[PDB]
Every structure is written in structure tokens, then in C-alpha cells.
Ligand binder design. Structure first.
Ligand code: PLS
Ligand code: PLS
Ligand code: NA
Ligand code: NA
Lengths: 387, 387
């Protein structure tokens, strides 16, 4: 218990998204947006104090030490070896997604996602005036799976140019096996599709599930695929605004960097650089401790819901700290479910329908909070469900 | 008991752009990129420490207190009154310029600048595949002036859609009079041109020169013009990454915000928000003290160069902390001037030619450093100039 996973810091004065509603209605307990109600690792807090003590807060660049820290993290944690020149810093992963869409496709061309998925995927495609192709995931034995026949159909019928892959997949928390990723890659090679693998949850695979970074699947995958990740989801530092793309293919790397500069989206803040380097240098023990806490919270929620709401269908995450809940067996509409949870149960969960039509009558639950808070949130979710 | 403008914090370990070359060649003295070698106001330092003590560094948004701080600053310092909903935060001004180009013009359409000017102006136009129209500034009696006859010709002959205005103008530090701004505005009305006024140096007008913010010139100007500014240049906090657009016209504001979201360039870091609010709420006395130091440094440089290098033509800034130096009386090429300053004099100044063809044989000198450092830099500049 060296690190504090037992007590949530009070965030009410910090202008957070997560606790905003609670500031007006103190009864509301938020468990929606993916940041954590855990204190950040102490080395990052110290690094922010140390930044203050620089005294001058001018223009800074991404250092060789930061580049090496990213290289070292990827090698040590994900067995992914590349060169410092392959790293492109971006203030966030969602920014990187828009840059990729703009760099690798033209207006009107088709971009494929596996639905239901993180809403900025569909939004970034549509707002960019690209054609969205939603490849609907199957649900079998409590897990999402890809229908590869329909995936190929979706690619061919729509002349898909870009595939935005989520790995681990949010929502659901699906940690794709190497064999699944290999089939995806072969389809991209066949049909000349560029693949962007959003691996922001890569450090949060649980219960023995192992993240397989996309370009580690086959040595040639870097010819068409790039990887996005960050320290921010792993270490709860989203407000520091830094992330990266690993782009080993020279042409793809130049294309991305060019579009990033066209958009004047090439700079990152000083603390963005500092916090990522610090997290990667010092964060491993904290991450190990976090993952044990997350596993306990998830197991608790699954068992509690099984006992108190056996009609509630719970997808057990293989990774991420987010649980996908299916209220389909209840006599509720999508809107009535939202009103029930928010107004009667006083719990704020993400509306599943935000993620696509497959999310109708679902909600997403964030369990990256102390066990006592998770216990209360689960109690509230089961309190008011209709007979 | 008073603010420190006498000693410069050591920056060699902070991965700064400004001191980067000096990290490898200790002989080199930088006076190029516009950040200051002055300690930032103490309250911003404290705000960074306070941010560390939030303990959780998750997702945040722009608070009503920050919005009010910007409103209050704009009203009290620039007599510019508008509503909180007119403010759009962007991680930087150069980001905002690209968003504006993309939002308000189509590919192939013409964008006008007054050359020579801050290089990202020309770059952002060119990289965006817009046609660049450079309206060349006159130089008369040591000051840049607009040729309004040619400006109108440039607008009409090229069907200009967007005018990127720099006010105060960098380089040269020209603080455009109200009457000059009114003539520009009237041309934009006549010819249906949208105008973006980059007023990042607005708080740094000197020697009795007063900034006139563009939309304060006429109540009609908001129909076609928006204002970009920031706390970063004023208060030496560029690394914190926040700035704003004031867009009073509903259509222009929606267009800008839409494009910002298309580009996923809508979020700002938590410290970005914090540092700007803090600077505006506590910064005025520091700024008053700064301006006295800057005037002293500029006066020193002008007089020193007048004695030690009478052939060197020095444009005295009306604002900004940057001096535009003209070496055209010397038997030098643009390349030879750069080599002389950098390799013999051991000083790093911005290359004038970066700013446009009018900057050939020029260099830009940054005097926002302690007087003792400025004295040394000036001594170096005059040491090795050829007969
Ligand atoms: C697949 C994926 N890609 C990107 C991000 C966020 O990226 P950014 O913070 O780097 O922009 C998230 C976090 N998503 C959070 C925050 O919105 C959530 O509530 O789901 C994500 O799940
Ligand atoms: C007219 C103008 N607009 C914008 C900026 C910087 O804007 P940003 O840092 O907010 O993107 C500057 C600072 N310019 C610095 C940093 O490059 C200089 O050395 O000139 C500027 O002079
Ligand atoms: Na659908
Ligand atoms: Na020119």
C-alpha cells in the first residue's frame, strides 16, 4: 500500500469533465469518462513542481531523453523495437486520428471502423467528409469478435482506404489475439488499406491477457500500418496533453508529419513532454499496483452484478478499466435507461448508444476508482432496475 | 521586494529552442526566437506548484473564471468589450492561423499578408495550398508603411479571400495607427475579404505607442474580422500552450470552431488554462516593470549601434521586444551575413530572409534579456563587420 489506491483525491475545484455535474448536484457519482480517481504516481507530481522551478516557461523541444524513454517503454513493455526517428509526438491520440484521416485519404474516400467503438472514431471520419464504413462486431460467449467475411465485404464494396483499429478495443475491453491481428493485416495487404492502430489502452491488459502491438505481428506490417499510443491513459495524465505515433515506414511517416505541419498541429507543451518522460521512466511499479486494483474492482463488479442483477449482461473486460453493460433484457428504451441511471440512480455512465447502434441499451462503467467508490457505484446501478 | 530583470535563469538543461545550440557550443549567445531570458512573474510559478498539488492530472475544460480573466484583460487593457461566448481557446496562435485558413478559404484561393512578416504566415498559406499574395511593405523614415494603392491592387487582381494581419507587425515592431487599420478594414469590406488580426504582441507596445485592437476601430469590423491573441508573448509562458481567438460574428465563430473540431484541435492542456488565467489576473505590475527594462535595452542598442556601426540601419521598434537590423550597406551576401554573425561574432539572430525577400541582408535581434547580456550581444554584432 505504498501507493494510494484507497482514497480518491477531491477533484471538485479542478474544472474536470468527470466531476462537473457533481459540482451542481452533489448526489451524482461519475463513472463515465476515462480518467481515474486515483492519485497520479508521485514522480510525475514532483516533475510538475520541478517544471515550476525552471522559472522561465518558454518554447521547448522533444529531447533525446524523451525519445529514448518512448523507445525503451515500447521495447520493454511491448517487445516493439524501432528507431528514435520513427516517433512523432502529437498533443493527443484523437488529434493524431484526424491528422491520419487527412493525410492518408481524400475527401469522399471510405474509412472503416469496427463498431461499436470510441465515439471520436466515427466523428472524426464524418466531420472530415470521409465515408464511414462501420464493420459491426459480433458478440459470442461474452466477447466481441470480428466477422472476417463481412469485414472483407465491407472493405471491397466501399473501396476502403483506411482502417482505424482500436486495440485494445474500447468499449468492451477486447484484447485482440495475434491471430486476429494477422488476419486483419493480410486483408489490408490484399486490398491496399492503410491501418492506424489506436493502442492507447495497451498498458492496461488484465487477467493474463497480453497486448500485441500491431507491427510486432509480422515484419512487413509497418509497410501499411502505424501505431498510436500515449502515457496518458496508463498513468492518468490526460490533462498534460502528449502522445505519439510510431511510424516506421518512411513514406507514411513523411505523409503524417506533413499533414501535422499543414495543420500547425506539430507542437506539444513543455509539461506534455516532461510528464510522459517521467511516467515512462518511473511508472512501472505504480502500474503493477494499479493493475491489481483494477482486476479486484472488475471481479467485484462482475460478481456483485451476478448476485444483485442477474438479468444485467456484463462483458468482462480483457483490458482497459471500463466495463460494457447490456441492459437489453430490461423493458427500457435507450432514453429511459439513461434517465433511470442518471436521475434515479444518480450515477453517470457513458451512454452506449454514443458508440454506435450496437450500443443501444448499453452503458459503459469506469472502475478506475477506489474499491469503496466502485462498491457504491455498483449498488446504485442495481438499485432501481425494473421488474 | 522587486521583480527580477537583472539575472537570467540558466536554461541549458531545459531543452529550450533558444539555448539549444549553446548546449553544444558554449561560445554562442542566442538572441533569436521570441521568448525572454527573464524569470516569469511569481504567481505563474506558484500556479504550476498548485497544479501539481491537484494530484490527479485528468481531462479539464476552460472555466468561467478563465473566460472572465480574458474578458477583463481585453476590456481593461485594450478597451475591447465582448461576450464570454466570443472566446475560443486554441493551444497556440499559429494553430489558429491554420484553422482560419482552412475554415475561411478553399484550396487555390488567395490569402494576403504584408511582407516581410513572421514566417509561419507565408508557410501556413503555402502548405495549405492557398495562393500567397505578399503585399510588400514600404519603408519610410525608419518605419514600415502600407502602400494602400498596391494593397488594393493586390486584393482585386488576385481575388483575395483572407487577409492575415500582424498587429503589432513582426518584424519591425510596427504599431499600426487607428487610421491605418480603418483603411485596411474598409478595403476588406469593399472587396469581401475576411481578416484575421494576429495581436499576439498587443501588450508590448512601447515608447508611448498604443495598441489599437482591430475590432475596436469600427463596430462593423466584427462582421469580417477576428482577433487572435495570447498571454504567452506578454508573460514569457509560450511552453504552457494556450491562446485565444475573439470571434464576435456568429457565422465566423461557428466556422472557426467547426474547423477546429474537424482537425481535433479543440482541446488545451490544463496548465495552458491555468497559466493564462493566472498571468492576466496578476501580471499587470510585472508587465509595467518589463516595459521599462525593454525600453532601456532598445535605447541602449540603438545608441550603441549608432556609435559602433553607423552603417548598420536599425529600425526602432514601436512595440515587441525585437529589433529589425538592416546590413544592406555592407558588402555581404545574405549567406555571408549569416556566417559572419553565427561563426565569427558567435551570436544567433533570426535570418531576415526567413521573413520574405524584403528581409534579405537583415537580421532580427531579441532584447528581452538582462541589460548585461544585451550589452554583450550588441558588442558581438559590431565586432567583425567588414569595411
Ligand atoms: C481508443 C481511444 N483513443 C484515444 C483516447 C483519448 O486520446 P487522447 O486523450 O490522447 O486524445 C481514448 C480515451 N477515451 C476516453 C476519453 O474520452 C474515454 O472516455 O473513452 C480512447 O479510448
Ligand atoms: C506574429 C506572431 N504570431 C504568433 C506567434 C507565436 O504564436 P504561438 O506560439 O502562440 O503559436 C508569434 C511568436 N513568434 C516567435 C516564435 O516563433 C518569434 O520568434 O517571432 C508571432 O510573432
Ligand atoms: Na450502426
Ligand atoms: Na517577395
Amino acid at each position: 500500500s505504498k501507493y494510494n489506491f484507497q482514497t480518491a483525491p477531491n477533484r471538485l475545484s479542478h474544472h474536470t469533465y468527470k466531476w462537473k455535474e457533481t459540482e451542481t448536484d452533489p448526489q451524482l457519482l461519475p463513472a463515465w469518462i476515462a480518467d481515474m480517481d486515483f492519485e497520479v504516481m508521485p514522480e510525475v507530481k514532483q516533475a510538475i513542481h520541478d517544471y515550476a522551478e525552471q522559472l522561465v516557461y518558454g518554447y521547448t523541444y522533444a529531447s533525446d531523453e524523451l525519445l529514448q524513454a518512448v523507445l525503451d517503454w515500447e521495447k520493454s513493455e511491448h517487445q516493439y523495437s524501432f528507431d528514435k526517428e520513427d516517433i512523432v509526438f502529437v498533443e493527443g491520440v484523437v488529434p493524431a486520428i484526424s491528422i491520419a484521416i487527412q493525410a492518408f485519404t481524400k475527401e469522399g474516400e471510405a474509412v472503416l471502423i469496427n463498431s461499436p467503438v470510441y465515439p471520436p472514431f466515427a466523428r472524426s471520419v464524418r466531420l472530415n467528409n470521409r465515408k464511414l464504413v462501420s464493420n459491426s462486431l459480433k458478440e459470442e460467449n461474452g466477447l466481441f469478435q470480428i466477422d472476417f467475411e463481412q469485414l472483407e465485404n465491407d472493405i471491397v464494396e466501399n473501396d476502403v482506404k483506411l482502417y482505424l483499429l482500436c486495440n485494445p478495443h474500447n468499449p468492451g475491453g477486447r484484447v485482440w489475439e495475434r491471430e486476429v491481428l494477422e488476419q486483419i493485416g493480410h486483408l489490408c495487404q490484399k486490398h491496399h488499406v492503410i491501418l492506424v492502430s489506436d493502442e492507447i489502452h495497451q498498458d492496461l491488459t488484465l487477467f493474463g491477457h497480453e497486448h500485441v502491438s500491431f507491427n510486432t505481428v509480422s515484419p512487413d506490417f509497418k509497410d501499411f500500418a502505424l501505431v498510436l499510443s500515449s502515457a496518458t491513459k496508463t498513468f492518468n495524465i490526460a490533462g498534460t496533453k502528449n502522445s505519439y505515433a510510431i511510424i516506421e515506414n518512411p513514406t507514411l511517416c513523411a505523409q503524417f508529419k506533413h499533414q501535422q505541419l499543414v495543420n500547425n498541429h506539430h507542437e506539444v507543451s513543455s509539461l506534455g513532454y516532461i510528464a510522459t518522460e517521467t511516467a515512462y521512466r518511473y511508472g512501472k511499479p505504480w502500474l503493477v499496483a494499479l493493475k491489481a486494483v483494477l482486476e479486484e474492482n472488475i471481479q467485484f463488479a462482475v460478481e456483485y452484478f451476478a448476485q444483485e442483477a442477474p438479468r444485467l449482461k456484463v462483458m468482462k473486460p480483457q483490458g482497459t478499466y471500463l466495463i460494457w453493460l447490456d441492459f437489453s433484457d430490461y423493458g427500457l428504451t435507450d432514453d429511459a435507461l439513461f434517465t433511470l441511471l442518471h436521475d434515479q440512480a444518480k450515477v453517470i455512465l457513458n451512454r452506449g448508444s454514443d458508440y454506435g447502434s450496437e450500443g443501444e441499451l448499453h452503458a459503459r462503467l469506469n472502475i478506475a476508482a477506489p474499491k469503496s467508490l466502485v462498491e457504491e457505484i455498483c449498488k446504485r446501478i442495481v438499485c432501481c432496475l425494473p421488474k
